[PDB]
Design a protein around this ligand. Structure first.
Ligand code: NAG
Ligand code: NAG
Ligand code: NAG
Ligand code: NAG
Ligand code: NAG
Ligand code: NAG
Ligand code: NAG
Ligand code: NAG
Ligand code: NAG
Ligand code: NAG
Ligand code: NAG
Lengths: 426, 166, 197
């Protein structure tokens, strides 16, 4: 029987609080398909195989040779708009400065590399290597072809390099309006400030947060490789298209009530009035097989568009700004996101603030002094056993209770659980 | 059937005359009067894609073939096929007509259908220093628009009149 | 401009026109006219020729319904997004970038449209930026002073504190700067004087 996880028992008291004393910056990955493989079929090659009389009987049918092509054309344009609404959320192509010293962080695996003649980051090197008469030529000789995408891998690479040269040198000011320069040490101090933590934790632990970040990016290079199936949702969309195109070429050799499946043999053994009877069994059947493919491709494009629109939201709310949506931009208090190109998809590297090393304290709603209650302005009232201090909520920082972080509203007879102390005044 | 008849490098054993492929189609055959092995391959085919700026400016059109290397049909060979009817200029602009593989065509200046590589925008290097922040001094209130569909026209068909008409 | 509202109209027009044209196409029969088949034939054979049209029209009518189901899911997806953008943008100020207009979202005004809706997102776009010298903290008497709400800027000679989205200098005081630790761990701290009222 599958277990649902360990059985932890969080203690709950009236005067107990757990405030963390350290942090662990973790960089996770997120794979999302943003595109597909544009296909194009031919009516006079799939239905009629090198036949001239069959082309005459095919025109006698309805309009099932132009609404299928127009439907596949709409998919092709749709697969060219998904890559134009996600990787093109910026008009200008920002560039990284020559000197690379961002306070102590090592942006060497997500930034493009000039040595290799492909302009791809070290992280975007194993993504294009794992996601990969031959079959590509056999399907072409049956009327099933593949159209090349509009934006090549080179243009998508420099598109992910403009969203990565503004997130580090401008922060979130390059997606709203004009790109405003800002030092990265002062960028991680305003992102640490939107998760409850103050900015006096980064400037006092910059070298520690820089080592945790560098140690978290170096593991993504190994995690994606070591994992048996990491880029699997980018291969499922490829295998599904490599299966519908193979299940469609295998229906050209299955007779549906005729003497054979070769159209060149029905006209060489049967005169022309029994043929017309047995050719409509190898045309109407093949028309429904080609129609079933287009029908499933429309449902397939509806699943890719949902993931594409989701990728556009996670590249404008995780990359173009810090989000306050839990589980959306990673797993934890969201700080940053770096878009990484991938075959028919994108890889999000979410930086999440994860508290650690929590210690129990003694909490109190309000304190009493001079016959009036004092509530914490921004923080929590904790106690180390003998003295009462006011600390933050996402990080432990003992500070004396002064008259600069408490507001007096009420008396000491309405709040249940109010301790007595001495509110210092400067 | 149609197709090109060329010699094959296969190893047909002397009991096998025909030869199929992964789609159960004749890909090879043995000529009876010479006892050889030919490679039946289908004759050259592809697609046609006409590029037109519209019948409001001019009547010039570019013919884009799909799957040809300009040798099996101003000539230009892209990754999508042979583009006959447009010249490849060097200076890049914004895309006007998607051709494929990062190439678009526009009817710019004489007036002819030019071809160029897509331009993903202008380049604006952001000066990053250790103490240099850019604080804006003025504001510009802007009003944009987003056209989102909500509903479609409701329909109802007669399954006894469309199939059988009177 | 209203191109995505005409696309659903053109798709429905194309669907309602690709279904009627198939009423004049012989789906393997001798003719498309039902009267011609019933007249110029015999009962046993006529029930075979009328069977090739009654089947090629049921597949066309089923094709229309299948396409109307895949297309309704696209409309339902755009309807859920429109409902979301009429509650997060209109019924309040959203903090999601690019969701309610490009830039800093202030408000939005909904307006009706044929088979759709049109939002008018009022956004806040900064302009006319400049270049200043910044610093994490400022050492005055031994302890570091971090900006409570704002950013420390400098005009070359003096030091001020401005907002993060609009330039508005104010003298550095003990009411907008909090102290945290000494001046030994912060990298890039400058020496200045904080005012005390
Ligand atoms: C809180 O106080 C109430 C009343 O004394 C008591 O019933 C309850 O068990 C206490 N909760 C804990 C576990 O501290
Ligand atoms: C916080 O965690 C890091 C990494 O484990 C460690 O190096 C550091 O000493 C810890 N600091 C505290 C406050 O214990
Ligand atoms: C960044 O990481 C790479 C790979 O470990 C290393 O070669 C490079 O020296 C590092 N750069 C800095 C400045 O730490
Ligand atoms: C609690 O904190 C105060 C002030 O730092 C200290 O004097 C006292 O020894 C501490 N007590 C315990 C039990 O940690
Ligand atoms: C606080 O002081 C008042 C007045 O002496 C007393 O009645 C109350 O019990 C005290 N509460 C605590 C938490 O000691
Ligand atoms: C007749 O066919 C046999 C078997 O292929 C061949 O060896 C012989 O040369 C042929 N003769 C002629 C007249 O082609
Ligand atoms: C076309 O032929 C040239 C011959 O040099 C070759 O280099 C090129 O790769 C070919 N392109 C295609 C599309 O096959
Ligand atoms: C920031 O300081 C580092 C270390 O002195 C230096 O390498 C880097 O070039 C400086 N950046 C700028 C442009 O101020
Ligand atoms: C801000 O921009 C508006 C519009 O261009 C202009 O009228 C106004 O004078 C500007 N104000 C400042 C502070 O320059
Ligand atoms: C900086 O601002 C102060 C106060 O407005 C002014 O007195 C001083 O001259 C300014 N210095 C420069 C170089 O702008
Ligand atoms: C800043 O103050 C520190 C500590 O008193 C002193 O060591 C240093 O020389 C001062 N620097 C400047 C630029 O005044």
């Amino acid at each position: 029987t599958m277990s649902l996880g360990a059985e932890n028992s969080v203690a709950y008291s009236n005067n107990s609080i757990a405030i963390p004393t350290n942090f662990t910056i973790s960089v996770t990955t997120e794979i999302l398909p943003v595109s597909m493989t544009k296909t194009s079929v031919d009516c006079t090659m799939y239905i009629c195989g090198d036949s001239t009389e069959c082309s005459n009987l095919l025109l006698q049918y309805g309009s099932f040779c132009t609404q299928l092509k127009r439907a596949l054309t709409g998919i092709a344009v749709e697969q060219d708009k998904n890559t134009q609404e996600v990787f093109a959320q910026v008009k200008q192509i920002y560039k990284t400065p020559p000197i690379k010293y961002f306070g102590g962080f090592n942006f060497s695996q997500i930034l493009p590399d000039p040595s290799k003649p492909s302009k791809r980051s070290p992280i975007e090197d194993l993504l294009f290597n794992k996601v990969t008469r031959d079959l590509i030529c056999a399907q072409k000789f049956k009327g099933l072809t593949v159209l090349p995408p509009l934006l090549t891998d080179e243009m998508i690479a420099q598109y992910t390099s403009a969203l990565l040269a503004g997130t580090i040198t401008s922060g979130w000011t390059f997606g709203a309006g004009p790109a405003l320069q800002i030092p990265f040490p002062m960028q991680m101090a305003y992102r640490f400030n939107g998760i409850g933590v103050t900015q006096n934790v980064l400037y006092e632990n910059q070298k520690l947060i820089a080592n945790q970040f560098n140690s978290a990016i170096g593991k993504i290079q190994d995690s994606l490789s070591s994992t048996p199936s990491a880029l699997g949702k980018l291969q499922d969309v490829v295998n599904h298209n490599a299966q519908a195109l193979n299940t469609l070429v295998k229906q050209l050799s299955s007779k549906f009530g005729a003497i054979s499946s070769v159209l060149n043999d029905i006209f060489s053994r049967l005169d022309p009035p029994e043929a017309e009877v047995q050719i409509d069994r190898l045309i109407t059947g093949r028309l429904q097989s080609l129609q079933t493919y287009v029908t499933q491709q429309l449902i397939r494009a509806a699943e890719i568009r949902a993931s594409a629109n989701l990728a556009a939201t996670k590249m404008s709310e995780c990359v173009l700004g810090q989000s306050k949506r839990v589980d959306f931009c990673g797993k934890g208090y969201h700080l940053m996101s770096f878009p990484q190109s991938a075959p028919h998809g994108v890889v999000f590297l979410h930086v999440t603030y994860v508290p650690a090393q929590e210690k129990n304290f003694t909490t109190a709603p309000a304190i009493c002094h001079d016959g009036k209650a004092h509530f914490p302005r921004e923080g929590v009232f904790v106690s180390n056993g003998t003295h009462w201090f006011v600390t933050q909520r996402n990080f432990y920082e003992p500070q004396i209770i002064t008259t600069d972080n408490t507001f007096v509203s009420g008396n000491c007879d309405v709040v249940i659980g109010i301790v007595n102390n001495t509110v210092y005044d400067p | 059937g149609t197709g090109v008849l060329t010699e094959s490098n296969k190893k047909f054993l002397p009991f096998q005359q025909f030869g199929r492929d992964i789609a159960d189609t004749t890909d090879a055959v043995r000529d009876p009067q010479t006892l050889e092995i030919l490679d039946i391959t289908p004759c050259s085919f592809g697609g046609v894609s006409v590029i037109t700026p519209g019948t409001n400016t001019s009547n010039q059109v570019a013919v884009l073939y799909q799957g040809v290397n300009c040798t099996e049909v101003n000539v230009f060979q892209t990754r999508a096929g042979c583009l006959i009817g447009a010249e490849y200029v060097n200076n890049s602009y914004e895309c006007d007509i998607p051709i494929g593989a990062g190439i678009c065509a526009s009817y710019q200046t004489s007036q002819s259908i030019i071809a160029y590589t897509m331009s993903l925008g202008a380049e604006n290097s952001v000066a990053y220093s250790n103490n240099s922040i850019a604080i804006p001094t003025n504001f510009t209130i802007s009003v944009t628009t987003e056209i989102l569909p909500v509903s479609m026209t409701k329909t109802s068909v007669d399954c006894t009149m469309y199939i059988c008409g009177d």
